[PDB]
Structures are given as C-alpha cells and as structure tokens.
From a paper:
Most notably, hMPV and flaviviruses share an unusually long (∼10 residues), flexible β2λ (that is, the loop immediately following the β2-strand), which forms the SAM-binding pocket (SAMP) along with loops β1λ and β4λ, shielding it from the solvent. In CR-VI+, β2λ similarly assumes alternate conformations. Loops β1λ and β4λ also show a degree of flexibility. β1λ residue E1697, conserved in paramyxo- and filoviruses, forms a hydrogen bond with the NH2 group of SAM and is essential for both MTase activities. However, in the absence of SAM, its side chain either moves into the sub-pocket that normally accommodates the NH2 group, or, more markedly, turns towards the solvent in the direction of β2λ, which in this case assumes the ‘open’ position. β4λ forms a side wall of SAMP, and together with αD and β5 also defines a deep, hydrophobic cavity not present in other MTases, termed NSP (or nucleoside-binding pocket).
Residue numbers in the entry: 1614 to 2005
The structure:
Amino acid sequence: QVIDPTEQLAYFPKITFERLKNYDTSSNYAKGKLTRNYMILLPWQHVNRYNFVFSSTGCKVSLKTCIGKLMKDLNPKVLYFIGEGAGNWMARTACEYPDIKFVYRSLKDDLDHHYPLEYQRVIGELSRIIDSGEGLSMETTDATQKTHWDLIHRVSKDALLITLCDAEFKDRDDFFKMVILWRKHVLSCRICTTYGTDLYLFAKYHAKDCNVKLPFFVRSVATFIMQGSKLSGSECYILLTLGHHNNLPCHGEIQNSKMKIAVCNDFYAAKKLDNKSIEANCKSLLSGLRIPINKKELNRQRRLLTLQSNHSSVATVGGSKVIESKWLTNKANTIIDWLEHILNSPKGELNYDFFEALENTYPNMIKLIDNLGNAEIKKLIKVTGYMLVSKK
Ligand SMILES: [Zn+2]
C-alpha cells in the first residue's frame, strides 16, 4: 500500500555517459576521428531496460549521475518535466531525490502518453506530482506554445531552477521555439526573475549540423552523450543556462564520444530484477510468455502455436480470417525463433561487439525486422536483455 523510493532505485541500471564542458576558443589539436561500423539493425539500447514497461528514459538519463552537483548546489524543491510521456525519467528522479515535488507536462496529442503511467507504476501514488497537467488543452501542454509557459506556475510558485525536456521535436526550429520561450519566460516571469539568472534547461537535442548558434542570451554549460541513446543517431542532452550565447554541439564531436562509449563500455545490468515488470514485458511481446524463458517454455509456446494454427474457419460473418490470423502466428514464430537463438547462443558481455555477433549469427535477421514493428522490436530487446542477464 506504501513504498520507499530508494529501494526501487536498484531496478534502474547504472548509467555510462560523457560530459563535454563548453570552454572558450579551442584545444588546437586537430584530433582524429574514431569510427566503427556495427552491423546492427535492432535497438540494443533497451538491453538493460527489462524492469520497465511504458517508458524507460530513466535507464538512459539520470539527474544524480549527470547534474548531481547542480542538484546539490541549487537544492530544488520542485522540478519541471516537459515532453515527459509516461514519466520514467521523472520516476528515477523521485527515487534519487525522495523529497522533490514535480510539475509534469506532455503534449496531449493522443498518439503518445500524456499521463505518467510509468511513474505511477514505479512510485505508486502520484501525490508528489503537484501538477500533472490535468484539465489543460493541447496547446497549453505544447512546449513550443507561449500559453504552456504562461500556465506552468498554475500550482507551483517555485522558480524554474531546473527544467527537464525530453520532447522529440518535428524540426530544430521547434526546438528553438521551446528554448526561446523558456528564455522569454525566465526573464519575464515574476517568480523566476526574483530567483535570478541561475536557472537551467536540460534538454534532449539531435546534433545534425555544426556551428549552429543558440538563441541570444542562451549559453550551453555542458553536453552529455548517453550510452543509452540509439547508436545510429546523434542524440545528446544539453544543459543550458542564461549567458552570452555559444554553439550547439556539433555532429562530429557527438559521434566520436558516442563511438568511444560503444567500443569501450559495457551496459550495466540492474542490481535487482523486477519480476512483475519482466512478466508484463514478456506478455506484451508474446501473449502468455512465462518466466524463466527456457527450452521447455519455448517448446510450450511452439506447442500452443501448432495446436492453435489448426483451427477450422467457422463464425457468423467472414470479418476476421484465419489466413489473416496466420500473420499473428508468423509474428509469434519470428519471436520464438529469435528467443531460441538467444537461448542457444553463448553468454557474453552486454556490449555492441557481442550484439553484432548475436545479429550476424542469426539467419532470418531481415525477416525479423520486416515482420516485427518498431515497438515489438524494442520489447524483443527488453526480453533478450533479461535472457542474457539470466545466463550463467
Ligand atoms: Zn516562472
């Protein structure tokens, strides 16, 4: 009925990152490029995320790990989370800082979560979310709109000391709209102006270009490259504050940092296994999948399929075909074939070198990525990651 947040923090994996402090001029080194082309098609950054269901941003980013000193120095009573979705990042934060209250905002588009479903699952009550965006319109929940920032203080009368943004914007102009509006607020708003200029915005950014200037009076303090970000892209987290503007992180600097982590570092597994979560992810991937996943359980799911496939097409009206239902068995077979491959495969360390091995030792790789959808593949990697951790 009542849980302690500190005990839940063992279900969250250790985070590996790289901080790139924004200094004056340059190193004048003309440093070499590090490249490694991993032959991977699957989202392997979900390998250590088996203990989470709706959102798993907390497995990738953490405030204690990245901006711990700033958290101690500023000592915020309230944290503002924008573009939060199911709120797993906010959930990890609630476990690391058990006395902090939250103001949550997420776009009310009804395509993605606009309620903290993961936070509720991890924390239990939602009592610490003093403002959950309830009763707000689609534009007052959209960080690219002035009205969102105008109603941010409707419950909390604490200044925007630290704002966390994990929104995926359409384009960089939409990101700039958010950053400009944040600046406009922290310099207009009575509450925030009273605190001063020591106000921060820690936002997700995709380093596309080079030498792109931040808006006027918006200075980047540091850039964080996370091990948990999709290898393929150029995603990073940038800590911004008020001050003489500088440049956004460049695609080149990000790639080297991103590459070093992939080549050098292993993914840390969670200290404890949340068996209810793993069960939910297993059932979400394949309906009726039980833990532990072994030869017996995989053959039991194959038995359940072989007896299910032999069903005579009898109903009232021909609306849902058995030939159409054979596509659901096709997906199920694809899943079992992969999990069987994982089970038969040797134990290794959680790294992209071993992941490339797992993928290039599997014959129906292209049939897998063609048959399973993006969310299904993410679920498949959560389950795979559990299987690999369970080994030896
Ligand atoms: Zn304000």
